[PDB]
Amino acid sequence: LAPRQVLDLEDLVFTQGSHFMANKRCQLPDGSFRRQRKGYEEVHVPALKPKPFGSEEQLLPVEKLPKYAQAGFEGFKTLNRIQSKLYRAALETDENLLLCAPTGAGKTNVALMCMLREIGKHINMDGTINVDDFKIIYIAPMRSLVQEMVGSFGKRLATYGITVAELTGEISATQIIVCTPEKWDIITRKGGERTYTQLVRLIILDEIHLLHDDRGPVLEALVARAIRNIEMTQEDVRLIGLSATLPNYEDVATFLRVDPAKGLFYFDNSFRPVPLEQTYVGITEKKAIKRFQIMNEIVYEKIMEHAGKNQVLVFVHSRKETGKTARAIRDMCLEKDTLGLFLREGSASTEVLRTEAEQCKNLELKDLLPYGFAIHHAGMTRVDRTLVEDLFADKHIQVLVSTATLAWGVNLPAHTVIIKGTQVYSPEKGRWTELGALDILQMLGRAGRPQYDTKGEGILITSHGELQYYLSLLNQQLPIESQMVSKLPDMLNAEIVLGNVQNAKDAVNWLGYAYLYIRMLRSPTLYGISHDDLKGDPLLDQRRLDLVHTAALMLDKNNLVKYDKKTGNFQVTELGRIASHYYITNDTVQTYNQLLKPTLSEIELFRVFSLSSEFKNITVREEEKLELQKLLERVPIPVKESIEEPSAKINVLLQAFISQLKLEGFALMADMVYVTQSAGRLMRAIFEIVLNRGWAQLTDKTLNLCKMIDKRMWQSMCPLRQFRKLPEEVVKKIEKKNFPFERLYDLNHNEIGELIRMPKMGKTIHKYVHLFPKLELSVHLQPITRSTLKVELTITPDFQWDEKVHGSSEAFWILVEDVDSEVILHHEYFLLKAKYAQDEHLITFFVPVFEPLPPQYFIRVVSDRWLSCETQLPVSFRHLILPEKYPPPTELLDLQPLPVSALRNSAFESLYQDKFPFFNPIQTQVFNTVYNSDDNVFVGAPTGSGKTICAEFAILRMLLQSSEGRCVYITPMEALAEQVYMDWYEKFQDRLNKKVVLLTGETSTDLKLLGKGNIIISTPEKWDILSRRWKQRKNVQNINLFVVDEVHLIGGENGPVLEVICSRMRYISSQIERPIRIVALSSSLSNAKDVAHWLGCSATSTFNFHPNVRPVPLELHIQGFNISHTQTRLLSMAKPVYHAITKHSPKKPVIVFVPSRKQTRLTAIDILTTCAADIQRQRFLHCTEKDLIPYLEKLSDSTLKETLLNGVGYLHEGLSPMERRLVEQLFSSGAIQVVVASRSLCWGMNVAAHLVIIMDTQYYNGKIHAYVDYPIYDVLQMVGHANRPLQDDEGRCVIMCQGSKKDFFKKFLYEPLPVESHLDHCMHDHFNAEIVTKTIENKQDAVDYLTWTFLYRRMTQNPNYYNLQGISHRHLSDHLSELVEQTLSDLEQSKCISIEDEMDVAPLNLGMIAAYYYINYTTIELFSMSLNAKTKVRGLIEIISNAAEYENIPIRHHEDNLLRQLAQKVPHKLNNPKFNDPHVKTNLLLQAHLSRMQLSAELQSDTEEILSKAIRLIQACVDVLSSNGWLSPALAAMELAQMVTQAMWSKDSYLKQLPHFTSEHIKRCTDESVFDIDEERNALLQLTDSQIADVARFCNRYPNIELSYEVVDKDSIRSGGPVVVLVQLEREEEVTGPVIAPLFPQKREEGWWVVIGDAKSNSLISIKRLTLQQKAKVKLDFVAPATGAHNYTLYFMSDAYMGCDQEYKFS
Ligand SMILES: Cc1cc2c(cc1N1CC3=CN(Cc4ccccc4)C(=O)CC3=NC1=O)O[C@@H](c1ncccc1F)CC2
């Protein structure tokens, strides 16, 4: 709050723009002599004599500069004067440079030396260059020069393998981007700018004197932005300015962070390569054709001074004026006795035969070409332009007239250059004005030829009055100033939208970086600042604050910004966002805001477009009036009663452009080009505004108008026109025929050529008809709540793709509109990529509905580009059954906050009293019911309400009742399980001294834990594979207490297992008539009742609380971003995250959740760098660094150290548990204020914050090549993490999401959450399971089974969700019967079960196998299919890799390249792999694990999850193979189990199992067996005594095994009878501990196969699996063959070790 004054901006601004001279006088060099011809004044400035060399300064041949840089300098034998003075600065230092040189001094090669300096760091030895490690930006003022430079740099740098490209009218694949100031500004406004600019190490500003021009502010804004980004990102980016020699250049050096003593170089006019004789003509008085004829006379007089060979280049201001000036000279040169006729003295045909042979060509070229004359212009002569260029370059063409576009576009200097008149038509000023300084400079800069001329000459013809300006300009006296005040509001708004200025103060500091600042300082009077004011305020705080204040008020008026004078804060609006993004001035935005409405007609639309302030200076001149009227008659859209006003003129010009009408009047043509260049940007703007306001009619109109301005055709015309290669009269013929385009789809090419009376085209048209983008639409709708529906939209492309026509992709808009098509209820952008063309695309979202339900909605999918490309699908509500309105939440009573003493135990109270005096309202409200009663209870409540100690109440009561009591607690997540295990081990096993156990993967030890445990922690799957056998396991049958936490996760992925085990627990509870107490905890449910009845809770025992009763009040803020491209959106979220921290939780803890591992580190670093660039560093660090060093010494991660030092940690799955616990501990202690964790870790974090920020809502799924939404469950959890009852009076959450999703989060966060069962899609594994254990003996048993499920309750509540067509009991029974019938059918077809008498069922072999190992039935079905007698190890790996277990193995972003790399690196080459295939991935990763290839952290975690189920899969393969009686594939499967456990291959050293052995040790051992293994032992090779403890611990575990065997009654056996081989296994070591497999993640147990088989016929006769311990008896019984003589083989194989395998043959 500082005193602010409103300025009048128009007063401070420079009106004349580039034409403005701060120049007072002008001092002419040497000969100034004036010659007065009485019709005009002639002022001559002579050439400067060539300067003698300075001290020791000498030219430096290319061989001298470093070796790797010589490429691109071929064709250059010698370095330029300038470039030798600059070579050290450019190549050998990183300093910011300002190079001022005469125009044409070849400042280019200097820039190239800077470029080569940057390129030179990336060499990489045997690699040529690193292309993707950097980017270089070249900003040129003109598009022509952009193309020029792209060419030159492309050629010169081609040897380095570098791409140079043009951005202004694959971006990611280009190293050098050449482009215009406004183009780059456009790019870096987008906010996802950094995706482009993150890699930029170098920026080169060409012709930076452009600062003086009206376009100058854009340069200012650019440099300001980039410099501020250098501070903010800490990444150093080199700036190279290249400028003309003009006053104030040092101020430019200051602007560019150039050291005046180091990188600042100024060369006066004496350094011009060709010394220049200058002639300045100006015209005395004002009369008309007399004036113009004077001008043409001048031109004549001046040409003739060159008669024989000299080349003259004439510059004229119009594409017409080339002809007219060559006309006026040919009229006055050849009219009086043919003056100077035959400029070419080759009238005997020297070069005449070359130019007479080239005459064949069009326009005025053919006329002038036989003489020395030619023309080059912007009137589009195409190829003829290039030939004119070539012919002038070879010095054939003598006199060439052209437009400035030549001076900028290609390099062709002449000996003498004449510029005629210096008057040009400016469309935006709407007037005729004095030509831009840059144009004059570049043009006169073409005078004299570097190798062909000792002296150049140039002549500038102009009007006399007030044009002393040009003498100032070309003689280095015209000062460079700042125009920033003109454009300040748009610039400021741009900076506000990017988030770089959040208020007035920030804005003032931003102004500090502008060229305007330096200029205002050093020339205060010019900018209207009193020396007194400047004295009292040297840093110009007052002026900057005032300017900012004024611009702010202007933006606030026009509603681009909400701005309050008090705080001085800025709030971005949508209009401002769009305004910055589409580059439209703010008055325009206000106008659109005023006139835009849903019912706006098309006429009105065109008029609105006409009032755009970009056009405010356009007027209708008299001489064009007539033509306008003609145009008006030919354009289709009525221009309403606006007569010819500027408005109407603009309107009609745009229409005329879409109609492709030809124009004559040249000012009218200019105006047209100007309105049509703008038209697309402005219209795309309007489209965005109305699209996001949801206005359907106007969205449709505007989008269409965009496509029409783009494709230059009306909707009325034929879509085929959009193909440019098609003959226009063919199309006009088609249009003349009256009939729909659609019909062409159903016609053969014959009928096509037939209907059009032009059969020749009949085929080609057909082709194009089927090249036209076309989509099919399928919809599946499921209701969610009475207000909300879920839509699955399937998009199927129907058409042929053509890279030429469709490019790499095609964009569409999905529009969900209401019944009247007046409102867009939901919209989103859909991008169909060419590589993934032909895959069907599933797009899921929710849409709102209102209980007076309409008949239907509509889904349109419209092309973003193509005219008349659309598909509309009605979505019918006629049969829709909305689910039942859900009941009110349980009212929260305000009880006296019941004290810890209310628990009656002192030992119990000691667990609590230290932490809190009293229980919270929820905990006291439930306290009686859960602690005092034994009945089942459901508690709903927002995460962080402390639902945990209600469960604990239940547990304390269970222990109160019976000391030996047993309780099972299930959590959906293993992470949560482990946290609960720590917490409750301490709370129960330590203090109360009970037993607390945690269930693991393996069955036996888990059974044990079930036996000893008072408190059992488990995930649903573990408890499932346990309690499936509950009939046979008593410990499952008796448990006093069953607690399920997070039961709403029933509605999520893996929810079905939860549902199954809970329902099984209720079934058991009712079957043993000793009730199993059931405590269910959940987030607030919209429907608690269904879950209650399901689990047996009374309405009174049911506490379901609204999310607003949450103990710590939640302040939720949701921030929409309209961006479709995820990466871009992510990048534009970066700064708003920081602002969120500094607004809502400046001093308090902050958690930030991000989508991926990489984004944790990245966002951490963003927060860091931004923080330190606020001149607040360690502001997030609340201790001293010193204190932290002892902990940080324990860290491996460099970046994590560095960020933690600044008070920001991060958490991802790559970090060690030690590191994670460290970062968590620091964050809890308050040492670091900010932690950034990945979304995966939201369940595995014990920690809490004052502020939780959710950065985006989506993650990438590589399998489907698309982004998918966060489960609402994960988001509920994340929001839960901002809860601090002790420290905070409020929790605070800021969710950042794509705009389309915004409303969603406002709903199901504030309101309670509806859940459904997905069990009906999981039925098979569970039904098979209950058939094996005979809980289901028949179809009726399955129907009965289904009545215990949550599914059963939900089906009548929300029928349409489960695809029930009614809620009647008939519909329920019918649907359930259909479901069990289908499920059982599938299970029979998969050979898992047998069906008998249509009612009864029985378990089969494959079914039993699947149920036993807990494997999906399709996996073992697939096994049964793909296994045979000849199957081997490689095939086995392929087969287990295809398991359904590995389907959910993730494919991450850009992992296809890394997997593609892996594919060629592995022993077994894979056949036609798709690298988004998870099974291909798990295959390669399995080969990687076998070969001991170490990989990135992601691939390692993946390998862990694979190896988890690898064992059970292989054992299943054993069972299946043995049941078919195959020997060779078996035992190979066993060997595969072994070599998977010990991570080794088939043929390999058996010694690799011993720790610390490498491929070097093995080499000296053979010169092999673990059995062959003190002095002689350790003296074999290199040894340390810790490896000795480990190896000795290995050999005392590693199996020592002897086997005895007898075939009972050898002789008493003959054909057909039973044969019993009794085997005896004994080991001479006492077993202590598990298997040792360092590379195998989990802790396994030895297991062994005793096998009997005939090795000849390849038959497996008998098999048995067991576990040894000390000694074991093994009975193998099998049936006997005939003729009493048979030879068998007895195998003994492990599942763990190689080499322990034994063989005994017998008979
Ligand atoms: C992409 C999208 C667009 C829109 C949405 C929601 C989405 N979703 C859906 C979605 C579903 N589920 C499953 C689920 C399970 C239990 C309870 C609720 C949902 C998630 O877990 C996460 C998820 N994320 C989304 O973003 O709402 C629309 C909308 N907004 C307000 C009112 C009505 C309405 F339809 C606005 C358009």
UniProtKB/Swiss-Prot annotation:
Q: In which tissues is it expressed?
A: Widely expressed.
Which intervals of the chain are annotated as region Interaction with C9orf78 and WBP4?
Answer: 1-1707
Q: Which residues carry this modification: Phosphotyrosine?
A: 300
Question: Where is the motif named DEIH box mapped on this chain?
Answer: 206-209
- Gene Ontology annotations for the cellular component aspect, listed alphabetically: catalytic step 2 spliceosome; cilium; membrane; nucleoplasm; nucleus; plasma membrane; spliceosomal complex; U2-type catalytic step 1 spliceosome
What keywords sit in the KW lines? Acetylation, ATP-binding, Coiled coil, Disease variant, Helicase, Hydrolase, Isopeptide bond, mRNA processing, mRNA splicing, Nucleotide-binding, Nucleus, Phosphoprotein, Repeat, Retinitis pigmentosa, Spliceosome, Ubl conjugation
Q: Which residues carry this modification: Phosphothreonine?
A: 1019, 1356
Q: What, per the annotation, is the impact of changing residue 1169 to A?
A: Decreases ATP-dependent RNA helicase activity
Q: What is this protein called?
A: U5 small nuclear ribonucleoprotein 200 kDa helicase
Q: Which gene encodes it?
A: SNRNP200
